[PDB]
Amino acid sequence: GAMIHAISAVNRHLYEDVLEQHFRLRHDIFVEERHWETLRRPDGREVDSYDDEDTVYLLALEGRRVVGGHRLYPTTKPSMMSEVFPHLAAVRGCPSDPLIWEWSRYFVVRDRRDGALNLQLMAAVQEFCLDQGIAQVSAIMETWWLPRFHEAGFVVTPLGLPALVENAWTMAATVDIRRQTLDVLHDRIGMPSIVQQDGPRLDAVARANLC
């Protein structure tokens, strides 16, 4: 059936159509719906300084329609946490490691909310990272994400004090990538694999080491 596709520098030539579609959906969702006005752009594409040659996109596709997704960025480069929100990680420190990737821009289009897709997206980050040998992901998120992580069996390590960010309670944390977490999620989604990787093989950890 429908799969989550891992899109990076090595295979984006197969997904240029899909990538553009997702930038516009990100604008509809994060700018128009969430009202994150600092991300508004006149081209109607929601693109920031962490959308570059090293970004990995995990996009839920139905045919060529993007129905959900999220992205990963190496913490060996300047990151959203290190550059924008370092005060949120003042207790433990901002991650900087080839084996830790920054996780952001999680979305499900309205048509697919409150269904099977969400848990598939939760499984997808675990599956991709385990395959790549990535040990942890880091995230800045609103505190309503905590019960969602816990419900999916995600092992969460807070990096600092929660704080108001543009009027919303926000925190920085890592998530442990675990075979055990993934195994349970595979059972729950009723699929042995949720991540499709077309085109040339990506060596994410090697790329992050170069950075």
Ligand X SMILES: CC(C)CCSCCNC(=O)CCNC(=O)[C@H](O)C(C)(C)COP(=O)(O)OP(=O)(O)OC[C@H]1O[C@@H](n2cnc3c(N)ncnc32)[C@H](O)[C@@H]1OP(=O)(O)O
Ligand Y SMILES: C[S@@+](CC[C@H](N)C(=O)[O-])C[C@H]1O[C@@H](n2cnc3c(N)ncnc32)[C@H](O)[C@@H]1O
For binding to ligand X (CB under 6 A), which residues are involved?
Answer: 29, 33-34, 70, 103-108, 113-114, 118, 139, 141, 144-145
Q: Per rule CB under 6 A, is residue 58 in the interface with ligand Y?
A: no
Q: Is 80 in the site for ligand Y (CB under 6 A)?
A: yes
**Residue 96 is a binding residue for ligand Y (CB under 6 A):** no
With CB under 6 A as the contact rule, the residue among 2, 10, 39, 135 that binds ligand Y is 39
- C-beta of 170: minimal distance to ligand X in Å? 10
In single-letter form, the type of residue at position 36 comes to: W
Residue 77 buriedness (CB in 10 A; 0-12 / 13-18 / 19+) = middle
* Partner in contact with 23, chosen from ligand Y, ligand X, none, beta carbon below 5 to 8 Å by kind: none
Identify residue 4 by its one-letter amino acid code: I
What minimum distance in Å lies between the beta carbon of 22 and ligand Y?
Answer: 13
Q: How far is the CB of 87 from ligand Y (least distance, A)?
A: 13
Place of tokens 């998530």: 175
Q: Which of ligand Y, ligand X, none does residue 118 bind to, with CB < 5 to 8 Å depending on kind?
A: ligand X
167: three-class secondary structure by DSSP: coil
Binding site partner of 108, from ligand X, ligand Y, none, Cβ cut-off 5-8 A by kind: ligand X
With contacts defined by CB under 6 A, name the span among 57-65, 109-117, 121-129, 139-147 that binds ligand Y. 139-147
Q: How far apart are CA 83 and CA 68, in angstroms?
A: 26
Spell out the alpha helix ranges (H) of 91-153.
Answer: 117-132, 145-151
Q: Which does 113 bind (CB under 5 to 8 A by kind): ligand X, ligand Y, none?
A: ligand X
Check residue 84 for interaction with ligand Y (CB under 6 A).
yes
38 interface partner picked from ligand Y, ligand X, none, CB below 5 to 8 A per type: ligand Y
145-180: b (≥16 Cβ within 10 Å) or e: bbeebeebbbeeeebbeeeebeeeebbbbbbebbee
Token couple for 156 = 């969460």
Tokens of 26: 């990100």
